[PDB]
Amino acid sequence: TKLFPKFSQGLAQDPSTRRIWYGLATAHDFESHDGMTEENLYQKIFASHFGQLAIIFLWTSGNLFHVAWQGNFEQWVTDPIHVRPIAHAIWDPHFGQPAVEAFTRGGASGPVNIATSGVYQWWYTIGLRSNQELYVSSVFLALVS
Amino acid sequence: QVIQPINGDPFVGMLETPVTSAPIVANYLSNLPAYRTGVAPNLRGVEIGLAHGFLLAGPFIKLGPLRDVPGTAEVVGCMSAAGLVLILALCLSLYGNAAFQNQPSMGKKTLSGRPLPQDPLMSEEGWAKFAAGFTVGGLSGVAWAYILTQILPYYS
Amino acid sequence: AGREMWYPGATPPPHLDGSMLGDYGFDPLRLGTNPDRLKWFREAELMNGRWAMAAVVGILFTDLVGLPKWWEAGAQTYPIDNQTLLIIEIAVFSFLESKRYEGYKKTGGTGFAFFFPFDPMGMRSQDKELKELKNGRLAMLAFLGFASTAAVNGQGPIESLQTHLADPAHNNIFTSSVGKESCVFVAVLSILPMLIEANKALGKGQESVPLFPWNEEWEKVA
Amino acid sequence: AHVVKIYDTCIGCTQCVRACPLDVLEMVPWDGCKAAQMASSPRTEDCVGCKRCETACPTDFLSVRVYLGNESTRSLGLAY
Amino acid sequence: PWKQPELDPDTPSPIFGGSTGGLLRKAQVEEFYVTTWESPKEQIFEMPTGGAAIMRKGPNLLKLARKEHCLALTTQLRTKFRMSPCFYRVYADGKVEYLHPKDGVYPEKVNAGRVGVNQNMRSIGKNVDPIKVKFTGSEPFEI
Amino acid sequence: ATEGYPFVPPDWAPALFVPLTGLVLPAVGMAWAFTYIQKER
Amino acid sequence: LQEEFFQRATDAVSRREALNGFVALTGVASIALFGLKGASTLELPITKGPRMEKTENGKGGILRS
Amino acid sequence: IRHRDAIISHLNWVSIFLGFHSFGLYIHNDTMSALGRPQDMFSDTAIQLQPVFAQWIQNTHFTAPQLTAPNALAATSLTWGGDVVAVGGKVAMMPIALGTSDFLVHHIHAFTIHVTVLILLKGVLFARSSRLIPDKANLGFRFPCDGPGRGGTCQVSAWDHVFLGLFWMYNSLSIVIFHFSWKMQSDVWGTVTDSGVSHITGGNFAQSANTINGWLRDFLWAQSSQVIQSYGSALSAYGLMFLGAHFVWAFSLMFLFSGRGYWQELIESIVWAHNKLRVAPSIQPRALSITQGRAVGVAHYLLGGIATTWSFFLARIIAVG
Amino acid sequence: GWVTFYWHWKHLTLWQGNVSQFDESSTYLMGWLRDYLWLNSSQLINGYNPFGMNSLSVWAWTFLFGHLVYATGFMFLISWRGYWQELIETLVWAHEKTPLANLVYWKDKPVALSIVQARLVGLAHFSVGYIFTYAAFLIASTAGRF
Numbered sequence A: 001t002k003l004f005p006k007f008s009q010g011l012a013q014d015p016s017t018r019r020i021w022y023g024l025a026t027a028h029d030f031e032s033h034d035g036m037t038e039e040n041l042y043q044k045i046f047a048s049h050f051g052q053l054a055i056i057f058l059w060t061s062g063n064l065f066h067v068a069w070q071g072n073f074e075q076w077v078t079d080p081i082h083v084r085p086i087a088h089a090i091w092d093p094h095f096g097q098p099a100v101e102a103f104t105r106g107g108a109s110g111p112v113n114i115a116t117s118g119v120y121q122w123w124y125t126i127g128l129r130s131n132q133e134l135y136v137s138s139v140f141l142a143l144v145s
Numbered sequence B: 001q002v003i004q005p006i007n008g009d010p011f012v013g014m015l016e017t018p019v020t021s022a023p024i025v026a027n028y029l030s031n032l033p034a035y036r037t038g039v040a041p042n043l044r045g046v047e048i049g050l051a052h053g054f055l056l057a058g059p060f061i062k063l064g065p066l067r068d069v070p071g072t073a074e075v076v077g078c079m080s081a082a083g084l085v086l087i088l089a090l091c092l093s094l095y096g097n098a099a100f101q102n103q104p105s106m107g108k109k110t111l112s113g114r115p116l117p118q119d120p121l122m123s124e125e126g127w128a129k130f131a132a133g134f135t136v137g138g139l140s141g142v143a144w145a146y147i148l149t150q151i152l153p154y155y156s
Numbered sequence C: 001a002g003r004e005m006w007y008p009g010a011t012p013p014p015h016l017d018g019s020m021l022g023d024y025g026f027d028p029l030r031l032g033t034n035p036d037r038l039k040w041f042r043e044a045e046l047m048n049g050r051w052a053m054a055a056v057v058g059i060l061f062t063d064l065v066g067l068p069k070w071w072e073a074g075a076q077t078y079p080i081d082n083q084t085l086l087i088i089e090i091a092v093f094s095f096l097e098s099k100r101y102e103g104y105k106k107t108g109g110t111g112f113a114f115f116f117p118f119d120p121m122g123m124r125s126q127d128k129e130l131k132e133l134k135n136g137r138l139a140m141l142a143f144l145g146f147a148s149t150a151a152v153n154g155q156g157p158i159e160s161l162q163t164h165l166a167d168p169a170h171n172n173i174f175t176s177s178v179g180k181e182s183c184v185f186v187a188v189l190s191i192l193p194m195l196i197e198a199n200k201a202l203g204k205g206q207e208s209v210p211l212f213p214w215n216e217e218w219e220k221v222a
Numbered sequence D: 001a002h003v004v005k006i007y008d009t010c011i012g013c014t015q016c017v018r019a020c021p022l023d024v025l026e027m028v029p030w031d032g033c034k035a036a037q038m039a040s041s042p043r044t045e046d047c048v049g050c051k052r053c054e055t056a057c058p059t060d061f062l063s064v065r066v067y068l069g070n071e072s073t074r075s076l077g078l079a080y
Numbered sequence E: 001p002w003k004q005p006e007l008d009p010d011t012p013s014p015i016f017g018g019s020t021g022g023l024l025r026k027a028q029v030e031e032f033y034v035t036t037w038e039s040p041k042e043q044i045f046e047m048p049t050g051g052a053a054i055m056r057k058g059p060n061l062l063k064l065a066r067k068e069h070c071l072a073l074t075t076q077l078r079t080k081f082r083m084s085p086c087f088y089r090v091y092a093d094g095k096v097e098y099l100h101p102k103d104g105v106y107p108e109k110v111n112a113g114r115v116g117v118n119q120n121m122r123s124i125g126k127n128v129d130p131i132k133v134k135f136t137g138s139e140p141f142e143i
Numbered sequence F: 001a002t003e004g005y006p007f008v009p010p011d012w013a014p015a016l017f018v019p020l021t022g023l024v025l026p027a028v029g030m031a032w033a034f035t036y037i038q039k040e041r
Numbered sequence G: 001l002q003e004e005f006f007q008r009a010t011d012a013v014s015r016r017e018a019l020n021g022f023v024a025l026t027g028v029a030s031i032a033l034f035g036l037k038g039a040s041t042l043e044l045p046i047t048k049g050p051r052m053e054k055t056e057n058g059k060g061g062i063l064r065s
Numbered sequence H: 001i002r003h004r005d006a007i008i009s010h011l012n013w014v015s016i017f018l019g020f021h022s023f024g025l026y027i028h029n030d031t032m033s034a035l036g037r038p039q040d041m042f043s044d045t046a047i048q049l050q051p052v053f054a055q056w057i058q059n060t061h062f063t064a065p066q067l068t069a070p071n072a073l074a075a076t077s078l079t080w081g082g083d084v085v086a087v088g089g090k091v092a093m094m095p096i097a098l099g100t101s102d103f104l105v106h107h108i109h110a111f112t113i114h115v116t117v118l119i120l121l122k123g124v125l126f127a128r129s130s131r132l133i134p135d136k137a138n139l140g141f142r143f144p145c146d147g148p149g150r151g152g153t154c155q156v157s158a159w160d161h162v163f164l165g166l167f168w169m170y171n172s173l174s175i176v177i178f179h180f181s182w183k184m185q186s187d188v189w190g191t192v193t194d195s196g197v198s199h200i201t202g203g204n205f206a207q208s209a210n211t212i213n214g215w216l217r218d219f220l221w222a223q224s225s226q227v228i229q230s231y232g233s234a235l236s237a238y239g240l241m242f243l244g245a246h247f248v249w250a251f252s253l254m255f256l257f258s259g260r261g262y263w264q265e266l267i268e269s270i271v272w273a274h275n276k277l278r279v280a281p282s283i284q285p286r287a288l289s290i291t292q293g294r295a296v297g298v299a300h301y302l303l304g305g306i307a308t309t310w311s312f313f314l315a316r317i318i319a320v321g
Numbered sequence I: 001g002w003v004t005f006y007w008h009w010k011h012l013t014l015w016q017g018n019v020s021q022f023d024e025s026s027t028y029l030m031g032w033l034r035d036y037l038w039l040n041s042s043q044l045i046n047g048y049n050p051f052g053m054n055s056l057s058v059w060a061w062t063f064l065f066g067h068l069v070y071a072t073g074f075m076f077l078i079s080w081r082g083y084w085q086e087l088i089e090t091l092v093w094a095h096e097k098t099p100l101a102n103l104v105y106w107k108d109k110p111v112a113l114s115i116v117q118a119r120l121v122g123l124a125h126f127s128v129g130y131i132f133t134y135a136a137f138l139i140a141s142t143a144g145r146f
């Protein structure tokens, strides 16, 4: 008898490798969990929705932080039609010398990745101009997360 | 009839073959540190780790990313081998915590009876001592393989 | 965990009953939850604190006598080459720390060389251990402050004290380049006892143990 | 292990117990059928869920039903 | 049957060579199964996990890893030589369990001595919906 | 700095943080999960 | 005599707690040394930079960046 | 039958070993090409795996008429020869040079054949009985399953082992004929000139068959440009055959991924529809059997793949060669 | 995939200026294939030639990566559990009856993936491979020229 499927006592009695896969797969199937009522199920879903909200806000805060750190948002503001957006810098130790040289796009120094997520146009449209404001947005979104 | 099962019983799987019934193979396997029941787990761990950490330095030095750099290929290969040795030591400790949280109830039942009460390797603290011997042997063998590339009459 | 606590109104950790001295209930992450682990961490704390005490009093002595800066002292000229100096340092420490570890195995005391405990004067008392622990932790924090003021200010402790006495309103940490970092950090540290109090208030009967990879307190959770 | 249930639609053809190579099913006397027999499953924990009894069942719908779930070392057909 | 028989370790075993299909470590840490039959002459039968073996004239003993192997051998023997065998279950601690002929007359017969178990007097498809048994821990077919 | 107070990370931070979450954090994840799965009651 | 040196080698790290702590400390120390000091001394081709390479992109015109 | 587990286990081990040290080399070369490090490749310019045994056999067979077969006028073939025969200005047969890429592809072939023979021999050996199902002999040769018991015994019959073996032989022979076509078009077939000999493709097999992306771009994309541009010409039927083969290959995956219960229920709905206005057939419509569905899927898959390769090969070799 | 093929090809022909090429080439499927999956894939597969490497080397690697994951999805989708159980049983016998490795023993018994699990993992591998290869091709064909 194991204890990894704490939600499913029958799954913990499984002595095979199927227990791991089924416990991972039936992780948020609260309606089939052992000894669980309706009210606790609803409260668990409420907490899970809060968790997904926190994850979403953390992810967009990270997008703001990485754009403000390693992007070319000021250069994109000065010239949107010419300068390409930059998502995040590339630090891969398995990269070769030509590989570093082939990813310094957008007028950057190190290896960077060109952003095609559309956040540069969106943030230029809503009045965000400097990376200071993107940094403040990132820390505020981390705070609300 | 050379081909026969061990101890004259057919209900088992593994059967006695001239690959296994050769006296050279049997005495080589019995004298290996992993099958030396009368020795402490840390000593056989030291021998096993020494052998494996000595062999692991080879491919990292010879085929490493900096193999064309003279004087730094051996250092990088040996420290990567030591890191791999540490990874295997972590694996050994995790296996000792995992497989020995319970207690065995039966012996090994060696040939012609005369079984030892319990193998100290198959315990929790025994396997922890085995992992300690393994990592000590691993870094010592890696360090020996480094200095064997420092003094040399041939190649490396 | 002692009536005096790390913040006033705190609850002791379940393993921190206060049997060992120097207890103040300060175990947020609960690093040591095993008595063998707890006593090894106490011995390691005493070792690092004693070295911090020796290093700090050497720092004040060297700054008082006028010797040059400590972080630049490694590049200064010295008799005996650093190679054989390092070699004899490991040569003597492979015996000193060996005797220390063997004495800790057989007795548990912090003796020196063949003398366990190395107390020829004989002021062995629990209050002496408590005073040593407090002064040691203060020297730990003092060495961290010395390293910080060597890094960002580039001046010794005596020069830092003179700059604090000359203009304390502006020649502080909070007006430096690591200023607002320290402001946010100390604001988080001020908020920190209230979040712990809120966890205790809402969690009236729950364990609420901090489950972390460094401890097996999560085994009782599930 | 799995759950094996026999409903009253069974007519006692005693062929569901022949198709099961695990001795899960058994035939008990009954009075609700012409053959005066009914399938029963005393050794239900030995079942693997191979549904050979459902294949052998002639009634529509099936008198003997096997429900999967809660696998064990005997329900998974493991010799190791 | 009339009296429950206990297996005898003194019965011989059929002549067979080494087969890789057979007992494993599960026979040590967990239970294993032993099949016993009485033969009038030396015949050749196929093992459920190996090749072909010659049974002995008289009692026989076969150790198999699973109950399915034992019942496959039992069905093969009953179809071929009308042997009517029986198999046991030997646990890791030495406990011996009697499995196949609990009444001694096989599951095909009734013997008027066994009770009904896991039988529903309702028709299949008359079970309640899962909404009616939600958050109860009981399946509709378990009622 | 001119309002670098929403703290700008150093230009050498990737060299420490990329292997930290590529090599150490996966190692802690495997070790913690493997201790979780092989836990008997 | 040979066994004693390795016995005292293991006795300080015999516990699985001690060896887990040792491998964790060495792993984080080595990873923190790598990149910060491990790179730029082996001349790893991630911390060097370009000479003057790959500023323009787009072979079908437009010539961004 | 007695030691079948040992045979299957050793065959599985050597299959996995061959797969790793035949395909991870390709993936590694793909990575170091994508990492901008061609000097770390498993290629001739970088560190190499020279097929010394094949080259030694070639040299022995070239020198075989000199000593071991003195009555032969020349070598038994021009694979290992030294002369380039040419008829009508086109190279009939010229010596074949074996390098690192040839070593990689030959060991990939060995891996693929070892896996296919593993599947077929496991199907043959475990057809009678197995540790999972001891009574597999009484279930016949071609049966779909023994039910979802023991975790699910689908495709446990020897027929389904052969059903997978058809796909694995398809993969093996497809890689074999791809190797043949690329090697001939890059190192044998071509037009002879007064200044040297020019092949169909400019020797791209030596420098492009070390990576999967190189294989793709320089064989399936560098060629097949005449199949797509065959419209309005004599080879347009080859393009039609190509796209119809794409259709039949893609249509097979319906019969392969799906099962029978969903299709039986859909057929039940269609039977209701035909019942509403009384066009119900007297023969009850039923879905294809599980073995029947597997057979249809593998047959349509093989037909689509074979006709795809047939159309591509023939259009490329007629529009160019 | 159909809606994104339509969007990408129509917009690519709009941006390049030859809307007539899409108008006269989207009628027949061979024109669709030749002028979308072949013409626009020229810059994608030239990410890392043996001659050299460019910025689209990551997109070609992602393209082949999605192909490989889709192929592993086929591996999980075509073959079904029941043959893998016997193969795993043979591997179990191999591990249990070998020197220097029977000392290390599993705590969780190796068991082949369940049929529902098989469908899930085949669908998962299929979908991530599909998404990655199409994203790589789309961004490489739209970034190679503009």
Ligand code: CLA
Pocket (backbone or CB within 6 Å): A055, A058, A059, A061, A062, A063, A065, A066, A070, A088, A089, A090, A091, A142, F009, F013, F014, F015, F017, F018, F019, F021, F022
């Ligand atoms: C969750 C969104 C997210 C994602 C996917 C990334 C992705 C990346 N970051 Mg970034 N990062 C983020 C948020 C994110 N970041 C935030 C919010 C911060 C500010 C605290 C940073 C600060 C940061 C630094 C300083 C560096 C990176 C770096 C990197 C790269 C290497 C991966 C790495 O080391 O992780 C980043 C590792 C960290 C420890 C920093 C993140 C701290 C997290 C967000 C807080 C913990 C939250 C939660 C408990 C755990 C998150 C998991 C959740 C998503 C399930 C990669 C492009 C490195 C790089 O090379 O830059 C390209 C680098 O040096 N990141």
Ligand code: CLA
Pocket (backbone or CB within 6 Å): A093, A094, B060, B064, B065, B076, B077, B079, B080, B082, B083, B086, B139, F018, F019, F021, F022, F023, G026, G030, G031, G034, G038, G044
């Ligand atoms: C995303 C995280 C990540 C990171 C940061 C790295 C980082 C690295 N990998 Mg990669 N790798 C990764 C994921 C990652 N890997 C994955 C997921 C795979 C599988 C697909 C690989 C597969 C892979 C291969 C196949 C190889 C690498 C190699 C390398 C190294 C590049 C060459 C180099 O610097 O020489 C290494 C230089 C070093 C300084 C590192 C050695 C330091 C080690 C970690 C330990 C040294 C301390 C040692 C224990 C001594 C202490 C003793 C103690 C008593 C104090 C570098 C350390 C190469 C390598 O290992 O080179 C030898 C190599 O051949 N990697």
Ligand code: CLA
Pocket (backbone or CB within 6 Å): H012, H015, H016, H017, H018, H019, H020, H023, H024, H027, H115, H118, H119, H163, H164, H167, H168, I071, I072, I074, I075, I076, I078, I079, I087
């Ligand atoms: C191209 C598609 C594809 C691929 C790659 C696989 C892969 C596999 N199948 Mg499968 N197969 C497929 C389609 C595919 N299948 C389809 C569609 C069917 C249906 C007919 C089958 C039918 C089938 C049968 C019937 C059998 C297999 C077997 C195998 C295995 C062969 C092991 C080997 O030698 O290769 C080596 C391994 C690989 C190629 C996997 C990729 C490894 C790459 C090179 C990366 C290397 C490791 C990497 C560095 C680690 C990354 C770490 C990271 C997580 C951090 C392997 C797991 C056989 C088996 O079980 O083993 C022999 C077997 O008997 N398959």
Ligand SMILES: CC1=C(C/C=C(\C)CCC[C@H](C)CCC[C@H](C)CCCC(C)C)C(=O)c2ccccc2C1=O
Pocket (backbone or CB within 6 Å): H254, H255, H256, H258, H259, H260, H263, H286, H287, H288, H289, H290, H292, H293, H294
């Ligand atoms: C599609 C499908 C079906 C449904 C397919 C069926 C019932 C077979 C249909 C065969 C048709 C009727 C053959 C004739 C086709 C056309 C009518 C021919 C037209 C010819 C023109 C000249 C008009 C299954 O039954 C099935 C079973 C198991 C696994 C997968 C599947 C599966 O994928």
Ligand code: SF4
Pocket (backbone or CB within 6 Å): D006, D009, D010, D011, D012, D013, D014, D015, D016, D017, D039, D053, D056, D057, D058, D059, D062, D063, D064
């Ligand atoms: S197969 Fe069905 S109908 Fe027939 S005897 Fe068994 S339960 Fe009754």
Ligand code: SF4
Pocket (backbone or CB within 6 Å): D004, D019, D020, D021, D022, D023, D024, D025, D046, D047, D048, D049, D050, D051, D052, D053, D054, D066, H149
């Ligand atoms: S599913 Fe199979 S083992 Fe279970 S009762 Fe039915 S026929 Fe017997």
Ligand code: SF4
Pocket (backbone or CB within 6 Å): H144, H145, H146, H147, H148, H149, H152, H153, H154, H155, H259, H290, I080, I115
């Ligand atoms: S999914 Fe089909 S082949 Fe697999 S066990 Fe079920 S009925 Fe048999």
